[PDB]
């Protein structure tokens, strides 16, 4: 549950808050953790 | 890859793994001796020198043939998640033959038909949020989800005509983090897309989203 249009990062992937109120995130494998 | 199984030697002659700074990162598709097609987000904003590619191996750590990058071409209109393809010119030319071949491409302006079958492959996590990173390639077969349905899951503006989706209503089968850029193909092994984005992985009523080779054929032919 997020406000549509907001952005965040989960590690190295960018996430976008879509119109349906959920996070769409890219699918890279993030290395340096 | 979630809900899939070990891929076999020769199932995807053209698939490559792409490391960044010596770690796993994305997959790709060899189009010719010096060209790899991956997702724009795998390479955009980053130093081209960090990237190595591996072709001709089920393993992401050994075997096959490797190459660093000579240049990178991001789609001119890559925006948000849309037009999410990049062309990578390779520093080492990788001939076809033996375990490697080149990808044939979905027809210009084609669009994956809802309900039809497609298979995606990669070295990504096997569960949503999983600490897993497979050494040997994985693969899953999933149905195409109509754009109208995907637009219902994500929102009309979130899903464009340069994207298409795949997944099963009740979840269970998907690409996931680490599969980005990697091939999804039809049953002729035609490259119809590259892994791009999604809400989690393999969730019920949340499809995997793919950059569409058919919809973006112009870009590819120009820079390949």
From Swiss-Prot, chain B:
* Localization in the cell: Secreted
Q: Which GO terms describe its cellular component?
A: extracellular region
Alphabetically sorted, this entry's keywords are: Disulfide bond, Hydrolase, Protease, Secreted, Serine protease, Signal, Zymogen
Looking at the UniProt record, the site noted as Required for specificity sits at 174
Domain Peptidase S1 residues, every copy? 1-224
The active site of this protein is located at 41, 84, 180
Per its UniProt record, what SUPFAM superfamilies does this chain match? Trypsin-like serine proteases
The EC number(s) attached to this protein equal: 3.4.21.4
The UniProt entry, under Pfam families, shows: Trypsin
Query: Disulphide bridges in this chain?
Result: 26-42, 150-165, 176-201
Note the superkingdom of the native organism: Eukaryota
The protein's matches in SMART domains, at most eight in alphabetical order, are given as: Tryp_SPc (SM00020)
Q: Key word Cell inner membrane present in the record?
A: no
Q: Which GO terms describe its molecular function?
A: serine-type endopeptidase activity
Q: Which reaction does it catalyse?
A: Preferential cleavage: Arg-|-Xaa, Lys-|-Xaa
**Biological process, per Gene Ontology:** proteolysis
Enzyme class comes to hydrolase
Does Cell cycle show up as a keyword for this record?
A: no
- InterPro entries membership: Peptidase_S1, Peptidase_S1_PA, Peptidase_S1_PA_chymotrypsin, Peptidase_S1A, Trypsin_dom, TRYPSIN_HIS, TRYPSIN_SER
Family to which the UniProt record says this protein belongs: Belongs to the peptidase S1 family.
Q: Give the protein's recorded name.
A: Trypsin
* Source taxonomy: Eukaryota, Fungi, Dikarya, Ascomycota, Pezizomycotina
